[model samples]
Target chain A: DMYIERAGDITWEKDAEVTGNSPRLDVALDESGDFSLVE
Target chain B: GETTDGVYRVMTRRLLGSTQVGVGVMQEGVFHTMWHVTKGAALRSGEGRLDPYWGDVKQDLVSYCGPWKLDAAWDGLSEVQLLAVPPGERAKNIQTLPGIFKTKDGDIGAVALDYPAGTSGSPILDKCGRVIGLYGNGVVIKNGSYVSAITQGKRE
Candidate 1:
């Protein structure tokens, strides 16, 4: 239905590379092949 | 080779709205790219005007982009609404690009480029014109350039 719908953090340019102060999330794949957060 | 194979030119919308250009690639038949490039893109699948997945970028949130690990892991991506062809630019869709996704590893770091500010999503091609990594950002070293790790989702 939707891909990303929340605001976590803003990434920035640092040391000439992309740097983000905000934490990120990861989609976890369960044993049953289901999708969930790694937490 | 001057081929578009698995490479595309794309742009993303920011929070308040910013129009930034980048690139995309075909992973498992679906176009994959850095989640950060899809900043503030809260559009849905049933939308009627999502033909090419275009949105307004009038001063979008500049840094409100997503990030992920080099592993085959993605960010907070619940669903995927991909546009076979990006809204702007006839990028000449061609999948199955040939090259080594080097960013997934930690061998190469320093590179030579003019500016890595807005070229966030461009493909870093090797001398063979094959993708090596997704150009994320770069910093001018004490006397050269240093590129940081890129956002990769495809593994195996």
Candidate 2:
């Protein structure tokens, strides 16, 4: 009954914008039904 | 307007043993990657250590490292498709999932569908049958009988 958290802090740089080259173009939902990335 | 020349992160859920692999790529170049044992839930970061049993089965974990060159290239993937069997028939069938799923928007680099069972880390294809992303784990519940755990691996 363990959970996985971000092992450490992530430095999210504005590497680029969402585009045709963006890996994931689909949006996912959280447990609360809020929109989130699919990665 | 959407942008390009950005970071592409790829994750594969436990197609190789019990490990979850993550690949990080950006326009600057290829850089970071990591994997760990899938113990409780799907892992998304390299902050945690492996279960210790995986000591020799795989390489030691890397907290954060990259900037490696990505020599290979592809324009990108469009018209993505998710091939899987219908859920009701899935449990009784022994072979891999069958049938292809697409989106109405007809966009490129889209997460086409939920990752089907037995296709973990399998290649997700474009309409042209080019490799777009590797199927990663992302469970999406539908009809209480099927779970779609699909993640895509991007090309550098």
Candidate 3:
């Protein structure tokens, strides 16, 4: 279950959500290059 | 009143260009399909039970071979259809019907999958092998395997 949703625009950013305790995470992408979530 | 008020607040935010993004965090060796029941049925299966036999709805899933790709109808494309009955009917109705995944835009991403069969409720690993739809009674063992598609539509 989810309780919140937010939106924003970024040239490059990371997307992450914390549901209660667990977290769903993803890296944002940009026009020039893709922002990734891997180390 | 609270529900209506919440809806009114949400209605103010218009939905424009949108897309659905889904990411599944499964066990060490579990596949994405097992994600549906990951919260309960899946977690429970890993601890003990697997491929459950009895339930309110008895069903099965099947798959076959495919040389699947998008665009041109890639040869060797197969499909899985028909319903898989209960254990008592395994021998009678457990026949391979069609392939799991379909070819789209010259690339195969996912297949038509039902319930129970894909419900291994166990952990599976991608292991560098990025595949789309896959189902089997005993995949690792090769007892009987089903493949739907490979990674194509990773829309996010």
Candidate 2 per-residue lDDT over residues B1-156, each given as its tens digit? 111222223334335433223322222322222223222123233453222111111211121222222222223432333332221222111212222222343332333243334333333334343333334333333323223222332222
DockQ leaderboard ranking: 2, 1, 3
Once all C-alphas are superposed, what RMSD does model 2 give against the true structure?
15.1
Q: Give the Cα-based TM-score of candidate 3 against the true structure.
A: 0.20
Candidate order by lDDT, decreasing, is: 1, 2, 3
Superposed model 3: Cα runs more than 4 Å off: A1-39, B1-33, B39-93, B97-156
Scored on chain A only, each candidate's TM-score is: 0.27, 0.25, 0.21
TM-score of 2: 0.27
The true-versus-predicted C-alpha distance at residue B144 of model 2, in Å, is 3.2
Docking class of 2: incorrect
What is the CAPRI rating of model 3's predicted complex?
A: incorrect
> Which candidate achieves the best DockQ against the true structure?
2
DockQ of each: 0.05, 0.05, 0.02
Model 2, B79: alpha-carbon shift in Å? 3.8
Query: What's the TM-score of every candidate structure?
Result: 0.36, 0.27, 0.20
lDDT tens readout by residue for model 3, A1-39: 101111111111122211111112222223322222322
What is the C-alpha lDDT profile of model 2 across A7-38, one tens digit per residue?
21112223212221123224454443222334
Question: What tens digits encode model 1's per-residue C-alpha lDDT throughout B1-156?
Answer: 112125444434433354435444432323334444555343222232111222223211121112221233212221111112233333221222121113221222222333334344444333223334454433333445433333333233
Q: How accurate is candidate 1 locally (lDDT)?
A: 0.31
